Protein backbone atom coordinates (compact mmCIF):
# COMPACT_ATOMS: atom_id res chain seq x y z
CA UNK A 1 0.00 0.00 0.00
CA UNK A 2 2.27 2.78 -1.25
CA UNK A 3 0.88 6.07 -2.58
CA UNK A 4 2.69 7.52 -5.61
CA UNK A 5 1.96 11.24 -6.04
CA UNK A 6 3.23 13.15 -9.06
CA UNK A 7 3.20 16.93 -9.35
CA UNK A 8 2.44 18.71 -11.51
CA UNK A 9 -0.52 16.95 -13.07
CA UNK A 10 0.42 18.64 -16.35
CA UNK A 11 2.69 21.32 -17.82
CA UNK A 12 3.64 23.15 -21.05
CA UNK A 13 7.12 23.84 -22.46
CA UNK A 14 8.92 25.16 -25.57
CA UNK A 15 11.24 22.93 -27.63
CA UNK A 16 14.65 23.30 -26.04
CA UNK A 17 13.54 24.15 -22.52
CA UNK A 18 14.24 22.01 -19.46
CA UNK A 19 11.52 19.92 -17.78
CA UNK A 20 11.53 18.52 -14.26
CA UNK A 21 8.69 16.48 -12.78
CA UNK A 22 8.82 14.85 -9.38
CA UNK A 23 7.29 11.84 -7.71
CA UNK A 24 7.02 11.57 -3.97
CA UNK A 25 6.38 8.15 -2.48
CA UNK A 26 4.54 7.69 0.79
CA UNK A 27 7.04 4.93 1.61
CA UNK A 28 10.83 4.85 1.30
CA UNK A 29 11.86 2.88 -1.76
CA UNK A 30 15.41 1.98 -0.71
CA UNK A 31 16.77 -1.52 -0.03
CA UNK A 32 19.63 -1.61 2.50
CA UNK A 33 21.00 -4.80 0.94
CA UNK A 34 20.72 -3.38 -2.55
CA UNK A 35 21.16 0.33 -2.01
CA UNK A 36 19.10 0.32 -5.25
CA UNK A 37 15.90 2.36 -5.58
CA UNK A 38 12.82 0.41 -6.61
CA UNK A 39 11.24 3.00 -8.89
CA UNK A 40 10.73 3.18 -12.65
CA UNK A 41 9.63 5.88 -15.11
CA UNK A 42 7.42 5.03 -18.09
CA UNK A 43 6.48 7.23 -21.03
CA UNK A 44 3.22 7.02 -22.98
CA UNK A 45 2.79 8.92 -26.17
CA UNK A 46 -0.79 9.44 -27.37
CA UNK A 47 -2.33 6.18 -28.59
CA UNK A 48 0.56 3.97 -27.48
CA UNK A 49 1.47 1.58 -24.69
CA UNK A 50 3.77 2.71 -21.85
CA UNK A 51 7.44 2.55 -22.78
CA UNK A 52 10.12 2.26 -20.04
CA UNK A 53 12.46 5.24 -19.62
CA UNK A 54 14.31 4.58 -16.36
CA UNK A 55 14.64 1.83 -13.77
CA UNK A 56 16.44 1.55 -10.44
CA UNK A 57 15.39 5.23 -10.29
CA UNK A 58 18.66 6.31 -12.03
CA UNK A 59 19.40 3.87 -14.86
CA UNK A 60 18.25 4.43 -18.44
CA UNK A 61 16.73 1.55 -20.41
CA UNK A 62 18.64 1.11 -23.65
CA UNK A 63 17.61 3.23 -26.63
CA UNK A 64 16.24 5.93 -24.33
CA UNK A 65 18.09 9.22 -25.23
CA UNK A 66 20.53 10.92 -22.77
CA UNK A 67 18.11 13.81 -22.38
CA UNK A 68 16.06 11.90 -19.80
CA UNK A 69 17.85 11.59 -16.48
CA UNK A 70 16.51 9.75 -13.44
CA UNK A 71 17.17 11.28 -10.04
CA UNK A 72 16.15 10.99 -6.42
CA UNK A 73 16.50 8.65 -3.47
CA UNK A 74 14.25 7.21 -0.77
CA UNK A 75 10.96 9.09 -0.90
CA UNK A 76 11.59 11.86 -3.37
CA UNK A 77 12.41 11.53 -7.07
CA UNK A 78 12.48 13.63 -10.24
CA UNK A 79 12.47 13.03 -13.96
CA UNK A 80 14.34 15.59 -16.01
CA UNK A 81 14.43 16.44 -19.68
CA UNK A 82 17.29 18.70 -20.72
CA UNK A 83 16.27 19.77 -24.21
CA UNK A 84 12.60 19.07 -24.86
CA UNK A 85 12.00 17.73 -28.32
CA UNK A 86 8.69 18.31 -30.05
CA UNK A 87 8.15 14.52 -29.94
CA UNK A 88 8.43 14.13 -26.18
CA UNK A 89 4.74 15.01 -25.71
CA UNK A 90 3.37 12.25 -23.49
CA UNK A 91 2.16 11.21 -20.07
CA UNK A 92 4.97 10.23 -17.72
CA UNK A 93 4.25 7.78 -14.95
CA UNK A 94 6.37 6.92 -11.96
CA UNK A 95 5.81 3.44 -10.57
CA UNK A 96 7.22 1.82 -7.48
CA UNK A 97 8.17 -1.85 -7.24
CA UNK A 98 9.48 -1.94 -3.68
CA UNK A 99 6.39 -4.02 -3.04
CA UNK A 100 3.27 -4.74 -5.07
CA UNK A 101 3.39 -2.30 -8.03
CA UNK A 102 1.55 1.03 -7.84
CA UNK A 103 1.57 3.94 -10.25
CA UNK A 104 1.50 7.71 -9.98
CA UNK A 105 -1.28 9.79 -11.55
CA UNK A 106 1.00 10.73 -14.44
CA UNK A 107 2.26 14.13 -15.54
CA UNK A 108 0.98 15.35 -18.90
CA UNK A 109 3.67 16.97 -21.05
CA UNK A 110 2.29 19.65 -23.40
CA UNK A 111 4.49 21.54 -25.87
CA UNK A 112 4.51 25.36 -26.22
CA UNK A 113 4.55 27.05 -29.64
CA UNK A 114 3.45 30.19 -31.46
CA UNK A 115 -0.04 31.11 -32.60
CA UNK A 116 -0.86 29.12 -35.68
CA UNK A 117 -4.12 29.97 -37.47
CA UNK A 118 -6.36 27.07 -38.50
CA UNK A 119 -7.05 25.96 -42.07
CA UNK A 120 -10.82 25.68 -42.59
CA UNK A 121 -12.52 23.16 -44.91
CA UNK A 122 -16.06 21.78 -45.30
CA UNK A 123 -17.67 18.56 -46.54
CA UNK A 124 -20.99 17.81 -48.29
CA UNK A 125 -22.85 14.70 -47.22
CA UNK A 126 -21.94 11.95 -49.65
CA UNK A 127 -24.41 10.27 -51.98
CA UNK A 128 -24.11 6.85 -50.36
CA UNK A 129 -25.10 8.49 -47.06
CA UNK A 130 -27.90 10.79 -48.18
CA UNK A 131 -29.21 7.71 -49.99
CA UNK A 132 -29.79 6.25 -46.51
CA UNK A 133 -31.89 9.08 -45.07
CA UNK A 134 -29.11 10.63 -43.01
CA UNK A 135 -27.09 13.80 -43.68
CA UNK A 136 -23.77 14.63 -42.00
CA UNK A 137 -21.91 17.84 -42.93
CA UNK A 138 -18.32 18.21 -41.67
CA UNK A 139 -15.97 21.10 -40.72
CA UNK A 140 -12.18 20.50 -40.52
CA UNK A 141 -9.99 22.86 -38.51
CA UNK A 142 -6.49 21.75 -39.46
CA UNK A 143 -3.32 22.75 -37.58
CA UNK A 144 -3.82 25.55 -35.12
CA UNK A 145 -2.60 26.53 -31.69
CA UNK A 146 -3.80 26.84 -28.90
CA UNK A 147 -6.53 24.21 -28.44
CA UNK A 148 -9.31 26.69 -27.75
CA UNK A 149 -11.20 27.21 -31.00
CA UNK A 150 -14.89 28.08 -31.25
CA UNK A 151 -16.81 26.68 -34.27
CA UNK A 152 -20.39 27.77 -34.97
CA UNK A 153 -22.31 26.04 -37.69
CA UNK A 154 -24.84 28.26 -39.43
CA UNK A 155 -27.64 27.28 -41.79
CA UNK A 156 -29.21 30.01 -43.93
CA UNK A 157 -27.90 32.52 -41.38
CA UNK A 158 -29.65 30.60 -38.61
CA UNK A 159 -27.33 29.73 -35.71
CA UNK A 160 -27.72 26.08 -34.81
CA UNK A 161 -27.37 24.51 -31.37
CA UNK A 162 -27.43 20.87 -30.26
CA UNK A 163 -26.85 19.34 -33.68
CA UNK A 164 -23.05 19.01 -33.86
CA UNK A 165 -20.20 17.18 -32.12
CA UNK A 166 -16.56 18.25 -32.05
CA UNK A 167 -13.48 16.04 -31.88
CA UNK A 168 -9.93 17.25 -31.16
CA UNK A 169 -6.76 15.34 -32.04
CA UNK A 170 -3.73 15.22 -29.77
CA UNK A 171 -0.80 17.51 -30.37
CA UNK A 172 1.18 16.80 -33.49
CA UNK A 173 4.64 15.43 -32.67
CA UNK A 174 6.39 17.66 -35.20
CA UNK A 175 4.45 20.90 -35.43
CA UNK A 176 2.75 20.78 -31.97
CA UNK A 177 -0.63 21.85 -33.42
CA UNK A 178 -4.16 20.51 -33.31
CA UNK A 179 -6.83 19.29 -35.72
CA UNK A 180 -10.52 19.61 -35.00
CA UNK A 181 -13.40 17.90 -36.70
CA UNK A 182 -16.88 19.41 -36.30
CA UNK A 183 -19.65 17.18 -37.65
CA UNK A 184 -23.16 18.53 -38.19
CA UNK A 185 -25.78 15.85 -38.64
CA UNK A 186 -29.48 16.19 -39.30
CA UNK A 187 -32.12 14.41 -41.39
CA UNK A 188 -31.84 14.42 -45.19
CA UNK A 189 -35.27 16.04 -45.10
CA UNK A 190 -33.77 18.78 -42.97
CA UNK A 191 -30.84 18.83 -45.32
CA UNK A 192 -32.97 19.76 -48.30
CA UNK A 193 -34.93 22.47 -46.43
CA UNK A 194 -32.11 24.99 -46.66
CA UNK A 195 -29.33 26.31 -48.88
CA UNK A 196 -26.55 28.03 -46.87
CA UNK A 197 -24.27 25.67 -44.90
CA UNK A 198 -21.41 27.50 -43.22
CA UNK A 199 -18.81 27.00 -40.49
CA UNK A 200 -17.90 30.15 -38.52
CA UNK A 201 -14.51 29.93 -36.78
CA UNK A 202 -13.19 31.97 -33.85
CA UNK A 203 -9.59 31.54 -32.65
CA UNK A 204 -6.51 33.49 -31.54
CA UNK A 205 -4.52 33.07 -34.75
CA UNK A 206 -7.54 34.61 -36.45
CA UNK A 207 -8.25 38.35 -36.31
CA UNK A 208 -11.60 38.17 -38.08
CA UNK A 209 -13.75 34.99 -37.72
CA UNK A 210 -13.27 32.72 -40.71
CA UNK A 211 -16.37 31.38 -42.44
CA UNK A 212 -16.32 28.56 -44.95
CA UNK A 213 -19.56 27.46 -46.54
CA UNK A 214 -21.27 25.82 -49.51
CA UNK A 215 -24.70 25.39 -51.14
CA UNK A 216 -26.67 22.15 -51.64
Amino acid sequence: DIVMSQSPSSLAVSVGEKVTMSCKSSQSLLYSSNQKNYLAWYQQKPGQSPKLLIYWASTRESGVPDRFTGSGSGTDFTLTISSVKAEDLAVYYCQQYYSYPTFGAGTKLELKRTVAAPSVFIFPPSDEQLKSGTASVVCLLNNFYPREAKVQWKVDNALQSGNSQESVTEQDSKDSTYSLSSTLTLSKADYEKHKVYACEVTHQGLSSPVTKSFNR
Binding site: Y93, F123, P124, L140
Partner: protein
Protein backbone atom coordinates in the same frame (compact mmCIF):
# COMPACT_ATOMS: atom_id res chain seq x y z
CA UNK B 1 12.76 -8.51 -31.91
CA UNK B 2 11.02 -8.86 -28.55
CA UNK B 3 7.36 -8.77 -29.54
CA UNK B 4 4.34 -9.01 -27.25
CA UNK B 5 1.09 -9.65 -29.23
CA UNK B 6 -2.30 -9.61 -27.48
CA UNK B 7 -5.77 -10.50 -28.81
CA UNK B 8 -8.25 -8.10 -30.36
CA UNK B 9 -11.18 -5.94 -29.26
CA UNK B 10 -13.62 -7.79 -26.97
CA UNK B 11 -17.34 -7.08 -26.86
CA UNK B 12 -18.74 -8.94 -23.85
CA UNK B 13 -22.17 -9.00 -22.24
CA UNK B 14 -22.43 -7.80 -18.59
CA UNK B 15 -21.79 -10.73 -16.27
CA UNK B 16 -20.09 -12.97 -18.85
CA UNK B 17 -16.33 -13.66 -18.85
CA UNK B 18 -13.47 -12.75 -21.14
CA UNK B 19 -10.03 -14.22 -21.76
CA UNK B 20 -7.52 -12.15 -23.66
CA UNK B 21 -4.19 -13.57 -24.76
CA UNK B 22 -0.59 -12.48 -25.16
CA UNK B 23 1.99 -14.35 -27.15
CA UNK B 24 5.48 -13.14 -26.27
CA UNK B 25 8.13 -13.58 -28.96
CA UNK B 26 11.82 -12.64 -29.07
CA UNK B 27 13.14 -13.85 -25.72
CA UNK B 28 13.20 -16.92 -23.50
CA UNK B 29 9.75 -16.81 -21.99
CA UNK B 30 10.64 -18.79 -18.86
CA UNK B 31 13.02 -16.43 -17.05
CA UNK B 32 10.66 -13.44 -17.16
CA UNK B 33 7.41 -12.97 -15.23
CA UNK B 34 4.47 -11.43 -17.07
CA UNK B 35 2.11 -8.69 -15.98
CA UNK B 36 -1.30 -7.29 -16.87
CA UNK B 37 -2.13 -3.63 -16.42
CA UNK B 38 -5.57 -2.04 -16.78
CA UNK B 39 -6.01 1.41 -18.35
CA UNK B 40 -9.46 3.05 -18.22
CA UNK B 41 -10.00 5.88 -20.67
CA UNK B 42 -8.33 9.18 -19.83
CA UNK B 43 -7.06 7.46 -16.68
CA UNK B 44 -3.71 6.15 -15.44
CA UNK B 45 -2.29 2.63 -15.27
CA UNK B 46 -3.34 -0.08 -12.77
CA UNK B 47 -1.31 -3.28 -12.28
CA UNK B 48 -3.57 -6.33 -12.02
CA UNK B 49 -1.24 -9.21 -11.26
CA UNK B 50 1.73 -11.09 -12.61
CA UNK B 51 2.72 -14.68 -13.30
CA UNK B 52 5.83 -16.75 -13.94
CA UNK B 53 5.69 -19.52 -16.57
CA UNK B 54 7.64 -22.10 -14.57
CA UNK B 55 4.80 -23.12 -12.24
CA UNK B 56 2.06 -20.60 -12.98
CA UNK B 57 2.67 -18.99 -9.60
CA UNK B 58 0.68 -15.77 -9.30
CA UNK B 59 0.46 -12.64 -7.13
CA UNK B 60 -2.45 -10.23 -7.46
CA UNK B 61 -3.53 -6.63 -7.09
CA UNK B 62 -5.54 -6.69 -3.81
CA UNK B 63 -8.69 -5.36 -5.52
CA UNK B 64 -8.57 -7.40 -8.69
CA UNK B 65 -8.48 -10.76 -6.96
CA UNK B 66 -12.14 -11.49 -7.59
CA UNK B 67 -12.20 -10.20 -11.15
CA UNK B 68 -8.90 -11.32 -12.70
CA UNK B 69 -7.32 -14.75 -13.14
CA UNK B 70 -3.94 -15.28 -14.81
CA UNK B 71 -3.11 -18.49 -16.67
CA UNK B 72 0.16 -19.28 -18.35
CA UNK B 73 1.11 -21.57 -21.18
CA UNK B 74 4.87 -21.54 -21.64
CA UNK B 75 4.58 -24.32 -24.24
CA UNK B 76 3.08 -21.66 -26.54
CA UNK B 77 4.83 -18.78 -24.78
CA UNK B 78 1.38 -17.27 -24.22
CA UNK B 79 -0.03 -15.72 -21.06
CA UNK B 80 -3.77 -15.34 -20.31
CA UNK B 81 -6.01 -13.07 -18.27
CA UNK B 82 -9.63 -13.79 -17.54
CA UNK B 83 -12.14 -11.34 -16.20
CA UNK B 84 -15.36 -12.58 -14.68
CA UNK B 85 -18.68 -11.17 -13.50
CA UNK B 86 -18.04 -8.29 -15.90
CA UNK B 87 -19.58 -4.83 -15.35
CA UNK B 88 -18.88 -1.42 -16.93
CA UNK B 89 -16.03 -0.72 -14.47
CA UNK B 90 -14.01 -3.32 -16.36
CA UNK B 91 -14.37 -1.46 -19.66
CA UNK B 92 -10.84 -0.26 -20.47
CA UNK B 93 -7.55 -1.17 -22.17
CA UNK B 94 -5.43 -3.97 -20.69
CA UNK B 95 -1.73 -4.32 -21.57
CA UNK B 96 0.53 -7.33 -21.36
CA UNK B 97 3.76 -6.23 -19.66
CA UNK B 98 6.93 -8.27 -19.25
CA UNK B 99 9.33 -7.91 -16.33
CA UNK B 100 12.28 -9.67 -14.76
CA UNK B 101 11.42 -11.50 -11.57
CA UNK B 102 14.97 -11.54 -10.26
CA UNK B 103 14.95 -7.73 -10.03
CA UNK B 104 11.30 -6.68 -9.85
CA UNK B 105 8.34 -5.20 -11.67
CA UNK B 106 10.00 -2.85 -14.12
CA UNK B 107 8.13 -3.59 -17.30
CA UNK B 108 10.52 -3.04 -20.18
CA UNK B 109 8.42 -4.67 -22.87
CA UNK B 110 4.63 -4.11 -23.05
CA UNK B 111 1.88 -5.33 -25.33
CA UNK B 112 -0.24 -3.25 -27.65
CA UNK B 113 -3.47 -3.18 -25.73
CA UNK B 114 -6.81 -4.75 -26.30
CA UNK B 115 -9.87 -2.54 -25.99
CA UNK B 116 -12.46 -4.19 -23.79
CA UNK B 117 -16.04 -2.88 -23.87
CA UNK B 118 -18.74 -4.41 -21.58
CA UNK B 119 -22.14 -3.77 -23.23
CA UNK B 120 -25.57 -5.41 -23.42
CA UNK B 121 -25.42 -4.37 -27.03
CA UNK B 122 -24.56 -6.23 -30.17
CA UNK B 123 -21.67 -5.08 -32.34
CA UNK B 124 -22.61 -2.88 -35.25
CA UNK B 125 -20.43 -2.25 -38.28
CA UNK B 126 -19.76 1.38 -39.32
CA UNK B 127 -21.04 3.14 -42.42
CA UNK B 128 -17.84 4.18 -44.21
CA UNK B 129 -18.74 7.34 -46.10
CA UNK B 130 -16.21 9.45 -48.04
CA UNK B 131 -15.33 13.11 -47.37
CA UNK B 132 -15.67 15.28 -50.49
CA UNK B 133 -12.58 17.21 -51.67
CA UNK B 134 -14.11 20.42 -53.11
CA UNK B 135 -12.84 23.95 -53.92
CA UNK B 136 -14.24 25.34 -50.67
CA UNK B 137 -12.19 22.48 -49.33
CA UNK B 138 -9.05 24.30 -50.46
CA UNK B 139 -6.49 26.79 -49.08
CA UNK B 140 -3.26 27.69 -50.90
CA UNK B 141 -3.65 25.02 -53.58
CA UNK B 142 -3.91 22.12 -51.14
CA UNK B 143 -7.11 20.08 -50.59
CA UNK B 144 -8.45 18.16 -47.58
CA UNK B 145 -10.34 14.88 -48.07
CA UNK B 146 -11.32 11.90 -45.91
CA UNK B 147 -13.61 9.09 -44.81
CA UNK B 148 -16.38 9.47 -42.25
CA UNK B 149 -16.73 6.29 -40.17
CA UNK B 150 -20.30 6.59 -38.94
CA UNK B 151 -22.43 4.58 -36.49
CA UNK B 152 -20.26 1.82 -35.05
CA UNK B 153 -20.36 0.03 -31.75
CA UNK B 154 -18.05 -0.51 -29.97
CA UNK B 155 -14.62 1.15 -29.87
CA UNK B 156 -12.39 0.90 -31.82
CA UNK B 157 -11.85 0.94 -35.55
CA UNK B 158 -8.50 1.35 -37.26
CA UNK B 159 -8.15 3.83 -40.14
CA UNK B 160 -5.22 3.86 -42.55
CA UNK B 161 -4.75 5.15 -46.11
CA UNK B 162 -3.31 3.41 -49.17
CA UNK B 163 -2.71 0.39 -46.91
CA UNK B 164 -0.07 2.33 -44.99
CA UNK B 165 1.81 3.90 -47.89
CA UNK B 166 0.46 7.22 -46.67
CA UNK B 167 1.24 8.60 -43.19
CA UNK B 168 1.84 12.27 -44.08
CA UNK B 169 -0.57 14.81 -42.61
CA UNK B 170 -3.22 12.20 -41.75
CA UNK B 171 -5.70 13.14 -38.98
CA UNK B 172 -7.79 10.25 -37.56
CA UNK B 173 -9.87 11.94 -34.83
CA UNK B 174 -11.02 10.42 -31.54
CA UNK B 175 -14.48 8.95 -31.78
CA UNK B 176 -17.43 11.03 -30.56
CA UNK B 177 -20.53 9.54 -28.91
CA UNK B 178 -23.76 10.47 -30.70
CA UNK B 179 -27.21 10.99 -29.25
CA UNK B 180 -27.94 7.55 -30.69
CA UNK B 181 -25.21 5.85 -28.60
CA UNK B 182 -23.05 4.77 -31.52
CA UNK B 183 -19.54 6.10 -32.14
CA UNK B 184 -18.63 8.15 -35.23
CA UNK B 185 -15.24 9.45 -36.38
CA UNK B 186 -13.35 11.13 -39.21
CA UNK B 187 -9.85 10.53 -40.51
CA UNK B 188 -9.04 13.32 -42.94
CA UNK B 189 -5.88 14.02 -44.91
CA UNK B 190 -4.77 17.28 -46.52
CA UNK B 191 -3.23 16.94 -49.98
CA UNK B 192 -2.25 19.04 -53.03
CA UNK B 193 -5.07 19.91 -55.46
CA UNK B 194 -2.55 18.71 -58.03
CA UNK B 195 -2.47 14.99 -57.16
CA UNK B 196 -6.30 14.93 -57.28
CA UNK B 197 -6.17 14.82 -61.07
CA UNK B 198 -3.83 11.83 -61.11
CA UNK B 199 -3.79 10.25 -57.61
CA UNK B 200 -6.01 7.70 -55.80
CA UNK B 201 -7.09 7.86 -52.11
CA UNK B 202 -8.53 4.81 -50.33
CA UNK B 203 -9.46 4.63 -46.66
CA UNK B 204 -8.71 1.24 -45.08
CA UNK B 205 -11.36 0.98 -42.35
CA UNK B 206 -11.48 -2.11 -40.12
CA UNK B 207 -13.99 -2.37 -37.33
CA UNK B 208 -12.87 -5.72 -35.94
CA UNK B 209 -15.55 -6.55 -33.35
CA UNK B 210 -18.07 -6.88 -36.19
CA UNK B 211 -15.62 -8.33 -38.70
CA UNK B 212 -16.41 -5.35 -40.98
CA UNK B 213 -13.96 -4.39 -43.78
CA UNK B 214 -14.19 -1.51 -46.28
CA UNK B 215 -11.74 0.21 -48.65
CA UNK B 216 -13.95 3.04 -49.91
CA UNK B 217 -12.59 5.49 -52.51
CA UNK B 218 -12.37 9.25 -51.88
CA UNK B 219 -12.75 11.29 -55.03
CA UNK B 220 -13.81 14.88 -55.77
Amino acid sequence: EVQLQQSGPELVKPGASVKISCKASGYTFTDYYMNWVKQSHGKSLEWIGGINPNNGGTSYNQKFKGKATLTVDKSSSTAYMELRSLTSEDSAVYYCARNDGYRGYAMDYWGQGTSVTVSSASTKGPSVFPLAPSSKSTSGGTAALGCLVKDYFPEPVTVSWNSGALTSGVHTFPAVLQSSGLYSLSSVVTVPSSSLGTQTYICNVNHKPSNTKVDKKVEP
